[PDB]
């Protein structure tokens, strides 16, 4: 089963929910653009390789509530991601693979 997260809380708050999700080795995650546009979802090559992290790093630029993105986690790690330009707050989230 893939996991999914929505870019900002229903009510209209920055914080991602669920902030962490679990996913399998080679399963997907989908991010759905809710609200508080523009979003990016930039992934840090923190304890994971550059290429992998880069492919997983959505440099994509979601404003329209509709354009979701997907990423595959081939390697069983933890990935951490953040939203650079998105005004200060601390858009923390991280995915955990099985």
Query: Residues with catalytic annotation?
Result: 39, 83, 86, 91
Report if residue 83 touches Cu ion, rule: CB under 5 A: yes
Distance CA 28, CA 43 (A): 15
Is 91 marked as a binding-site residue? Answer: yes
Residue among 3, 39, 53, 57 that touches Cu ion (CB under 5 A):
39
Q: Are 73 and 43 contacting, i.e. CB atoms less than 8 angstroms apart?
A: no
Residue among 86, 93, 95, 97 that touches Cu ion (CB under 5 A):
86
Distance CA 77, CA 37 (A): 29
Distance CA 45, CA 48 (A): 5
Is 7 marked as a binding-site residue? Answer: no
The residues near 8 (Cβ < 8 Å, ≥ 6 apart) are 14, 15, 16, 34, 35, 36, 39
CB of 94 to Cu ion, least distance (A): 15
Closest residue to Cu ion in the complex (CB): 83
Q: Are 79 and 54 contacting, i.e. CB atoms less than 8 angstroms apart?
A: no
Contact stretch for Cu ion (CB under 5 A) within 22-30, 46-54, 70-78, 85-93: 85-93
Query: Applying CB under 5 A, which residues contact Cu ion?
Result: 39, 83, 86, 91
- The annotated binding site is made up of 39, 83, 86, 91
């Amino acid at each position: 089963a893939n996991a999914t997260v929505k870019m900002g809380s229903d009510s209209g708050a920055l914080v991602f929910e669920p902030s962490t999700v679990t996913i399998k080795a080679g399963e997907e995650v989908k991010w759905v653009n809710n609200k508080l546009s523009p979003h990016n979802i930039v992934f840090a090559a923190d304890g994971v390789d550059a290429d992998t992290a880069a492919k997983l790093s959505h440099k994509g630029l979601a404003f329209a509530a509709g354009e979701s993105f997907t990423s595959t986690f081939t390697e069983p790690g933890t990935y951490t991601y953040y939203c650079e330009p998105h005004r200060g707050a601390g858009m923390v989230g991280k995915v955990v693979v099985d």
